[PDB]
């Protein structure tokens, strides 16, 4: 009969960078998705493989919740079977995904005058990511032919780039907060429903 802790994930003060997204496990408790779906403050609520309305009648073994902050134009890359600089190097969703994607504009909390530079995103890599993987290594990128180590002079670029957020940016540049859920719906005794 434990209420389920959805309040320390949606109302966290600071989300993490997209390249180091933070994941939280959810077990026991009693989920209640009707309140989330009726908030009417999210600008994007897409559910794959299950309709949101029928989410109060079936239950699962465990629920995964991972969150990050990305640009306003890259929000369409968080979907199964999409390509871009975010879906290839930062966060990848498997093609048989079954969950919901929630996002909402957060200009008033993540952008300050003079620019906010605490949010980073990977920009250079030698291969795409497998679904549900992270990398936090910042080894110097090798481009061209001449090998280089510990230097960033020519054709050797620092991988991580810095988002620049300002309150006066356009709608396509203001930061957005994303939370992605995931359900297994297979085997084992269930633990999360009510």
């Amino acid at each position, epitope marked *: 009969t434990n209420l389920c802790p959805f309040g320390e994930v949606f109302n966290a*003060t*600071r989300f993490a960078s997209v390249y180091a997204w933070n994941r939280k496990r959810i077990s026991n408790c009693v989920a209640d998705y009707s309140v989330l779906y009726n908030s009417a403050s999210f600008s994007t609520f897409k559910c794959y493989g299950v309709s949101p309305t029928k989410l109060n009648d079936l239950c699962f073994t465990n629920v995964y919740a991972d969150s990050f902050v990305i640009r306003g134009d890259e929000v369409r890359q968080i979907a199964p079977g999409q390509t871009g600089k975010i879906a290839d190097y930062n966060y990848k969703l498997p093609d048989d995904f079954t969950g919901c994607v929630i996002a909402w504009n957060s200009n*008033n*909390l*993540d*952008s300050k*005058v*003079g620019g*906010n530079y605490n949010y980073l995103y990977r920009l250079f890599r030698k291969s795409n990511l497998k679904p549900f993987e992270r990398d936090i290594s910042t080894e110097i990128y090798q481009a061209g032919s001449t090998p280089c180590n510990g230097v960033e002079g020519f054709n050797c670029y620092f991988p991580l780039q810095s988002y*620049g957020f300002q309150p006066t940016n356009g709608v396509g540049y203001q930061p957005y907060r994303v939370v992605v859920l995931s359900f297994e719906l297979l085997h084992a005794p269930a633990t999360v429903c009510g």
Partner: antibody, heavy 125, light 111 residues
Framework: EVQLVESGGGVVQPGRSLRLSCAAS????????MHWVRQAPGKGPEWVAV????????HSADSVKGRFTISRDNSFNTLYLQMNSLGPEDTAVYYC??????????????????WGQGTLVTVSS | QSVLTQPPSVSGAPGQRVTISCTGS?????????VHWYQQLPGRAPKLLIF???NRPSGVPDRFSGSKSGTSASLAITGLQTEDEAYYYC???????????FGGGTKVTVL
């Protein structure tokens, strides 16, 4: 010790243009953003403008937009403020202030930790 | 002009406590942004006194405390001496006007 010294203030007739600066010392000038804050005589302080740590992004107050331009030299450890077409409501003691290192909750909170000394700027004839 | 509303002057005598209340609107403080306080001696540049809610910085006595609740904030001075003859300002941030805002300032007087 963090210390900031400014100069460039003086009496001027209305309609002219002035340029003043403050020079920092004792810390890595490149890492921290900077703000310009003025204080009218008898009233409270007012915010003016801000520049990023590399000069690529900046912002100005609505009151003085289109008249005040700020610039920064990272190697020379000086930042400049340029005023054009001074008016009678620009008499103040302009201070240059340093952005706050740590602010805990949220990312939109700003505060000023180290202040300069100020220069008296007045307009008359 | 000052967006934040502050009392014009606060009197006092050595020994007891005095309080300064800095009240704000819906956007500036009610949104959730914090409140900071500075102290300006007569003839000197303002100096940071209380950054963030309470959270005193280095090199300050413990006589100064502050707190924020609802849409207002208050600063408390304990065991006042004659040395605190100065001005005090409250500062915050506003998300509608999109600039940092300052209070009207209070001149604490010691009798």
């Amino acid at each position: 010790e963090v210390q900031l010294v400014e100069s460039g203030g003086g009496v001027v007739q209305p309609g002219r243009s002035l340029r003043l600066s403050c020079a920092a010392s004792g810390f890595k000038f490149s890492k921290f953003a900077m703000h310009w804050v003025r204080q009218a005589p008898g009233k409270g302080p007012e915010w003016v403008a801000v520049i990023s740590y590399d000069g690529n992004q900046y912002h100005s107050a609505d009151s003085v937009k289109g008249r005040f331009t700020i610039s920064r030299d990272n190697s020379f450890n000086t930042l400049y403020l340029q005023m054009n077409s001074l008016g009678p409501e620009d008499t103040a003691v302009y201070y240059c202030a340093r952005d706050g290192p740590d602010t805990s909750g949220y990312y939109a909170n700003i505060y000023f930790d180290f202040w300069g000394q100020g220069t008296l700027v007045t307009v008359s004839s | 002009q000052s967006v934040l509303t502050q009392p014009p002057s606060v009197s006092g005598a050595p020994g007891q406590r005095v309080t300064i209340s800095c009240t704000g609107s819906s956007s500036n403080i009610g949104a959730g942004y914090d409140v900071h306080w500075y102290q300006q001696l007569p003839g000197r540049a303002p100096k940071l006194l209380i950054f963030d809610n309470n959270n005193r910085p280095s090199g300050v006595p413990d006589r100064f405390s502050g707190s924020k609740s609802g849409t207002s904030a208050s600063l408390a001075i304990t065991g006042l001496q004659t040395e605190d003859e100065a001005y005090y300002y409250c500062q915050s941030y506003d998300n509608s006007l999109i600039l940092a805002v300052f209070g009207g300032g209070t001149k604490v007087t010691v009798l």
